[PDB]
Structure formats: structure tokens, C-alpha cells
Design a binder for this molecule. Structure first.
Ligand SMILES: NC(=O)c1ccc[n+]([C@@H]2O[C@H](COP(=O)([O-])OP(=O)(O)OC[C@H]3O[C@@H](n4cnc5c(N)ncnc54)[C@H](OP(=O)(O)O)[C@@H]3O)[C@@H](O)[C@H]2O)c1
Ligand SMILES: NC(=O)c1ccc[n+]([C@@H]2O[C@H](COP(=O)([O-])OP(=O)(O)OC[C@H]3O[C@@H](n4cnc5c(N)ncnc54)[C@H](OP(=O)(O)O)[C@@H]3O)[C@@H](O)[C@H]2O)c1
Ligand SMILES: C[C@@H]1CN(c2ccc(F)cc2C(F)(F)F)CCN1S(=O)(=O)c1ccc(C(N)=O)cc1Cl
Ligand SMILES: C[C@@H]1CN(c2ccc(F)cc2C(F)(F)F)CCN1S(=O)(=O)c1ccc(C(N)=O)cc1Cl
Lengths: 261, 260
């Protein structure tokens, strides 16, 4: 990690992809990234909402802003979106995996279809994008940024499929970080553990069932960008203070030393 | 609190029961006088296991062969097994897709197969079995690993699938508490075990102390009989000590009333 204080200029001229960027934290990240003079390529499914975002980005001072629309249910699209984004920017420094299949609050009864879709979109596609991007990311000694959640560190009811997929990201990407450590690949992996953030999709899905405070999505977004710029292993963000301090697991840090050899 | 008589006449399914810990588990069940239905892809080996379970004092022993890459087989395998045994008390999810030790190298197929077999089939099996278990106030036992709790290199796809199990099955465990479904869920976090397949995979690259699979198998069954939420089993007691996660227990307890 960059033993250093975050500077907005760290992101100037940086060639950055942001997925699920048509709303919520994805949008806000893209805007922040634009104000810092980044080249931004964004994706999502709705081209309409995507274009609007691209408008707002160019004004803000984005060195370049582009969009590509498609669904990450389709892995062939996943792959091509990254090569195409590479084109539009002339390389890739930071890859921001953020999109998720749309979810709500339910007791799991029989939806094996929602479980697979969550696994494919929330997780597998992240792996596809990662493979697509790794080449460019090695040359630029860039960064992968992976947005996760409290539900991907601890267990909560009514978010089973979602939690499995976030847990799966932890498992896969943490495991990959260590491989890059051994094989000396200089590409940072940052896992971001977000508590409730006030996106319009979250507050819609939380209404009635859950009473808890939502942290701003604007600071949430900056915080994720900083964690990746500074190449941290993990980032925690949550309105509370209780929360953010327990997330770190030193005993885990301890056992991961058994391999060291 | 545990005593072998707990599993006498209990109806039990063991998956991946043709080799390693799965075979050992079926054998313990047989001694204990359980009704057992076992599975794997190979009928030849399942046959050998079934006759052995009988010699060991099994109240009943039968195999059903098929691949858990097929969610239709998985889902019918449970219907068929349950109807055979007249019900079901315990479901022991244990099988995995063939895995070896290598650096992730763009092999997305392996990552997906691992999610399919290691994680998703466990869910289909569970859905299929839930009505019978609700009826018997039975139990689901999920066999996981250290890589399902912590990050290691050379096991990326595998860890992903096992982490998946923890996040999914712990989440549903909370759900049953609250919807008063009396079906226990046990996650078993096992370090290295001396199964032929583990031993062939983990060498001669490195090697730590392998605990014995007969012990492991039994601790898994015990964990399940006693309805515990997690079971840890490793060669080193220092390792077992470090597996537990109190911060998590608190974050889940805190946000327990958070609310409804
Ligand atoms: N906000 C929170 O309370 C909270 C809490 C914990 C974790 N997180 C994490 O934060 C991240 C963003 O959350 P959010 O609430 O901001 O998300 P969101 O508002 O629901 O939107 C995420 C984006 O993903 C896109 N998307 C949906 N399906 C897609 C698909 N099949 N292929 C490609 N893109 C797709 C959506 O755009 P389209 O509909 O146009 O496709 C959307 O822009 C997620 O990774 C989430 O897990 C958020
Ligand atoms: N042994 C260890 O060092 C270790 C460490 C940590 C965790 N674990 C956990 O312990 C459990 C058992 O491990 P193990 O070492 O005992 O495994 P194993 O003996 O090598 O084999 C597991 C079983 O799964 C079956 N199987 C393979 N592919 C299948 C498929 N596609 N569909 C249905 N069944 C299939 C195999 O039978 P067929 O080939 O005939 O299909 C076999 O009976 C696993 O969940 C593993 O994650 C083991
Ligand atoms: C309920 C929220 C938002 N959610 C989310 C995000 C984006 C969406 F689009 C939809 C959702 C969801 F709510 F429907 F799941 C994902 C899951 N979580 S979370 O991990 O941020 C979380 C935070 C705090 C607590 C707590 N009780 O302290 C519990 C949880 Cl699960
Ligand atoms: C290597 C073993 C056995 N393995 C396994 C089991 C059954 C199989 F069939 C195949 C494998 C595998 F090794 F090939 F993945 C699954 C993964 N693990 S483990 O999680 O028990 C483990 C134990 C100790 C260390 C450590 N070095 O401190 C690391 C790990 Cl990942």
C-alpha cells in the first residue's frame, strides 16, 4: 500500500473503468473520477441513464468519458467490454467492479434461479472482467477494485444469494492477491466492505423491513476510489464506528501465514 | 453430550460418499445403526461402500449414482432417497468437483464448475430436502475448509465456492431461527485431512500435518448430531483456536435487532 496521503491528482489522467455506473455508488464514483480529470469508461445495461452520466462527467472535467451498454449476465459481453474500453482510453490503470444483479429483501424459499443469477452477475462476471483486464493492468501496474458489503463478511437473513456471492468475491479475490504476492504481479486488489449506503436502490429495498442509517453515497464513492488509488488490501465504509472496527480479522491475518514458504 | 445411539434409526444422506471423508462418514453411520443412502458418480465404488455399511451394522444401506453437475439428478436423488428410507433426518453435503493445486491462470471454466458442484448443487439438494427435514426436525451439514474461512494461494476457485457456502448457509441459518424452522445447520471447517485425494494434491509442493479422515468424519457427524453451528477440525489446536471469529458473532448479534 502507498504509505502516503490521498491526493486528488493521483487520479489525474488515470484510465479507469467503472461498472454498474448508471446509478448509486457507480455513478458517484464516475463523477468523482471526472472531477479529478480521469479518463472514465462506464458500463451498465441502460444506455439512456448511462449517456446522461457521461454528459455530467465531461463537464466536470473528465479527460475523457465514454459509455458501453450491455448486461454482465452475458460473459461474452463482459470480455469484450474491457477490450473495447481499453481501446477508447489507450490502456487501463484502474478496474472498478461494482455492478450487481438486482436484489431485494426475501426469505429464501425456492429461488435457485436468483441464487445462480447472483452468482453469475455479482461474482463470476467479475472474474471474467478481471481476466479481460489483467494484461493491461500489468503494464500499468494498475489496480483492481472490488465493491462488497457487510453481508459478504458476516451473515444476515433475507440476503442469502447476495451474501454467498459477496463471500465468494472475498474468497476468490483475496486468494488471487496472495498469488500475485508469490508470483510478484504488481496489480493491487482492493476489497471494499460497505454497510448500508443511501443509494435509491438500497433505500427502496430496505423500506419497512430494516431500520438503520444510510451513509452518503458521495463519500462512499470517494472512499472506494482512495482505497484503490492507495492500493490498500481492504476498505471499510459504514455510517457507524462500531461496525468499521470489527471488520478486520487479525486471527485471519494470522493463519494466512501458514503458507508463507 | 454425544453418544452413538443418537444416530440409530436416523435416516441420513451422505454425498461424495464413495471416497475420503465421505466414505468414512458413511461407515461411522453404519456402525451407529443408521439408515444410510450414499452418492457419488461411480457405482462400482458406491457398491463396495454399501456392502461394507451393511457389515458394519447399518439399519439400511443403498447407493444412488449420478453427477451433481446435474441439478436435475441432484433434485431427484433426494426425492428418491427420502422415499426409499421413509423420510430423512440428516443431510450431509460433502462432495466436491475434482480440484488440484494451481495458480489461477484464466481458467474460468474451472471457477464456474466449482461454483456449480461445490456450492450451487448444495443449495438444490437443500431445497429438495427441506420439507422432509422440517418434518423430522432434522439437520443439514455442510463440509467446508480452511480456504472457506481464510485466503490461500493456489486454491482460488475452490475458496470462492467454500466461502459461498458460508455466506449462503449462515444467512439461511439466521432465517430459520426467525421463521421458527427447526432444522439445524452445521458448517464444518476442516484443515488438511489425509484423504488420498487431498494427499495427492498437496505434494510434493509443500505439506503440513494431515489429521486422520476417520477422526474427521466422526467429528463431522458429532457436530451434526449435537446441532452445533460450526465444527472445526484441524491437526493443530492452535489452528482450531484461530478459526473462530468473535467480531463476526458480535456484528451479527448487534444487527440482530436491526430490525423487522
Ligand atoms: N448501497 C448499499 O446499501 C450497499 C450496501 C452494501 C454493498 N453495496 C455494494 O455497492 C455496490 C453498488 O450498490 P448500489 O446500491 O449503488 O447499486 P444499484 O443502485 O442497485 O446499481 C448497481 C448498478 O449495476 C447495474 N446493473 C444491474 N444489473 C446489471 C447487469 N446484469 N449487468 C451489468 N450491470 C448491471 C445497474 O445498472 P442497470 O440497471 O442500468 O443495468 C446499476 O447501475 C454493489 O456492489 C453493492 O453490492 C451497496
Ligand atoms: N481432505 C482434505 O484435505 C480436505 C480439506 C478441507 C476440506 N475438505 C472437504 O471435505 C470434503 C471431502 O473431501 P475429500 O478429500 O474426502 O474428497 P474426495 O475423497 O477426493 O472425494 C469427494 C467425493 O465427491 C465425489 N464427486 C466428485 N465429483 C462429483 C460430482 N461431479 N458429482 C457428485 N459427486 C462427485 C467423489 O466421487 P466420484 O469421483 O465417484 O464422483 C468423492 O466420493 C469436501 O467437501 C472438501 O471440501 C477436505
Ligand atoms: C441491506 C444492505 C444493502 N443491500 C443492498 C444494496 C444494494 C441493493 F440494490 C439492494 C440491497 C438489498 F438491501 F436489497 F439487499 C446489500 C446488503 N446490505 S449491507 O451489507 O450494506 C448491510 C449493512 C448493515 C447491516 C446491519 N443490519 O447492520 C446489514 C446489512 Cl445486510
Ligand atoms: C490443501 C487442502 C486440501 N484441499 C483439497 C481437498 C480435497 C481435494 F480433493 C482436493 C484438495 C486440493 F488441495 F487440491 F484443493 C482443499 C484445500 N485445503 S485446506 O483448506 O484444508 C488448507 C489447509 C492448510 C493450508 C495451509 N497451507 O496452511 C491451506 C489450505 Cl487451502
Amino acid at each position: 500500500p502507498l504509505n502516503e496521503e490521498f491526493r486528488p491528482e493521483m487520479l489525474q489522467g488515470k484510465k479507469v473503468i467503472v461498472t454498474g455506473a448508471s446509478k448509486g455508488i457507480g455513478r458517484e464514483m464516475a463523477y468523482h473520477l471526472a472531477k479529478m480529470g480521469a479518463h472514465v469508461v462506464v458500463t451498465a445495461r441502460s444506455k439512456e441513464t448511462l449517456q446522461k452520466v457521461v454528459s455530467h462527467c465531461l463537464e466536470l472535467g473528465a479527460a475523457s468519458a465514454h459509455y458501453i451498454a450491455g448486461t454482465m449476465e452475458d460473459m461474452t459481453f463482459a470480455e469484450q467490454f474491457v477490450a473495447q474500453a481499453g481501446k477508447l482510453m489507450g490502456g487501463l490503470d484502474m478496474l472498478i467492479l461494482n455492478h450487481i444483479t438486482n436484489t431485494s429483501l426475501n426469505l429464501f424459499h425456492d429461488d435457485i434461479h436468483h441464487v445462480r443469477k447472483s452468482m453469475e452477475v455479482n461474482f463470476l462476471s467479475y472474474v471474467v472482467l478481471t481476466v479481460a483486464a489483467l494484461p493491461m493492468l500489468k503494464q500499468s501496474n494498475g489496480s483492481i477494485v472490488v465493491v462488497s458489503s457487510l453481508a459478504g463478511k458476516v451473515a444476515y437473513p433475507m440476503v442469502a444469494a447476495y451474501s454467498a456471492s459477496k463471500f465468494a468475491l472475498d474468497g476468490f479475490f483475496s486468494s488471487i492477491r496472495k498469488e500475485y504476492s508469490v508470483s510478484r504481479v504488481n496489480v493491487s486488489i482492493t476489497l471494499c466492505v460497505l454497510g448500508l449506503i443511501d443509494t435509491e436502490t438500497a433505500m427502496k429495498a430496505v423500506s419497512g423491513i430494516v431500520h438503520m442509517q444510510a451513509a452518503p453515497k458521495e463519500e462512499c464513492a470517494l472512499e472506494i476510489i482512495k482505497g484503490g488509488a492507495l492500493r490498500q488490501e481492504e476498505v471499510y465504509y459504514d455510517s457507524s464506528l462500531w461496525t468499521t472496527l470489527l471488520i478486520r480479522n487479525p486471527s485471519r491475518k494470522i493463519l494466512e501465514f501458514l503458507y508463507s514458504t
